[PDB]
UniProtKB/Swiss-Prot annotation:
Residues 152-161 form a propeptide. The gene is CASP8. Signal peptide: none annotated. The chain holds residues 224 to 479 of 479 of the full protein. It is found in: Cytoplasm; Nucleus; Cell projection, Lamellipodium. The modification Phosphotyrosine is found at residues 111, 157. Thiol protease that plays a key role in programmed cell death by acting as a molecular switch for apoptosis, necroptosis and pyroptosis, and is required to prevent tissue damage during embryonic development and adulthood. Initiator protease that induces extrinsic apoptosis by mediating cleavage and activation of effector caspases responsible for FAS/CD95-mediated and TNFRSF1A-induced cell death. Cleaves and activates effector caspases CASP3, CASP4, CASP6, CASP7, CASP9 and CASP10. Binding to the adapter molecule FADD recruits it to either receptor FAS/TNFRSF6 or TNFRSF1A. Isoform 1, isoform 5 and isoform 7 are expressed in a wide variety of tissues. Highest expression in peripheral blood leukocytes, spleen, thymus and liver. Barely detectable in brain, testis and skeletal muscle. The catalytic domain is sufficient for recruitment to lamellipodia but catalytic activity is not necessary. The modification Phosphoserine is found at residue 164. Changing residue 157 to F: Abolishes phosphorylation at this site. Lack of efficient localization to lamellipodia and lack of promotion of cell migration. Lack of interaction with the SH2 domain of SRC. Lack of interaction with PIK3R1. It is linked to Caspase-8 deficiency: Disorder resembling autoimmune lymphoproliferative syndrome (ALPS). It is characterized by lymphadenopathy, splenomegaly, and defective CD95-induced apoptosis of peripheral blood lymphocytes (PBLs). It leads to defects in activation of T-lymphocytes, B-lymphocytes, and natural killer cells leading to immunodeficiency characterized by recurrent sinopulmonary and herpes simplex virus infections and poor responses to immunization. It comes from Homo sapiens. This is Caspase-8. The modification N6-acetyllysine is found at residue 1.
């Protein structure tokens, strides 16, 4: 319930510091639009620092491709959290839905891995809600996406477009929080990461935050708050 998360553990947040975008520039067009000139651990520490100032438990992971992310999918079962009713999953590597396998992106069925928490297959974590953050920043054109490979893309990289957008990511799973991406109102990182962290110690819920800065993709029945206590 609202303000009922009051326990020893604060919250366990995951953050993938996968800086290697060589095979991710195509699947993840948002990984070639970052700040290389000035900002080494800024773009990866900005997600961690938000939970550090709250005294939360962060799991910063290094350059781990999808093959290594499997070693995190098992940890969720090893935890077997009985009292802890708060958690957040932040993934960097996401394919364009229906694309082929990749090295830095993904080569595995995301829809199966995320389905390992179903109350009919393994009702363990289903006794509590969950949160999923997504980089909707879209700083550059996300229309890039071809079947061919890419190796030496220094400056004269690949550039293509497709007929209409492509998104089928809607599990409609109530009792959860999703940050997936008419007016021009869209989701992004633009003051979003620094505003959510400011609303954390204010005692504001996580339900009115993603839309504080439309078509908000969320489904809950109770007030999902992330207090610092």
């Amino acid at each position: 319930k609202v303000y009922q998360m009051k326990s020893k553990p604060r919250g366990y947040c995951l953050i993938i510091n996968n800086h290697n975008f060589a095979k991710a520039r195509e699947k993840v067009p948002k990984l070639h639009s970052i700040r290389d000139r000035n900002g080494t651990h800024l773009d990866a520490g900005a997600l961690t620092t938000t939970f550090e100032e709250l005294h939360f438990e962060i799991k910063p992971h290094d350059d781990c491709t999808v093959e290594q992310i499997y070693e995190i999918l098992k940890i969720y079962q090893l935890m077997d959290h009985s009292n802890m009713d708060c958690f957040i999953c932040c993934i960097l590597s996401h394919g364009d839905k229906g694309i082929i396998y990749g090295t830095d992106g993904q080569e595995a069925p995301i829809y199966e891995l995320t389905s390992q928490f179903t109350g009919l297959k393994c009702p363990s974590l289903a006794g509590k809600p969950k949160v999923f953050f997504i980089q909707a920043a879209q700083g550059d054109n996300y229309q890039k996406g071809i079947p061919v490979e890419t190796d030496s893309e220094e400056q004269p990289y690949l550039e293509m477009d497709l007929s209409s957008p492509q998104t089928r990511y809607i599990p409609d799973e109530a009792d959860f929080l999703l940050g997936m991406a008419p007016a021009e109102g869209t989701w992004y990182i633009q003051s979003l990461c620094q505003s959510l962290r400011e609303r954390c110690p204010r005692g504001d819920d996580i339900l009115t935050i993603l839309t504080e800065v439309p078509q908000p993709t969320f489904t809950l029945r109770k007030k999902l708050v992330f207090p610092s206590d």
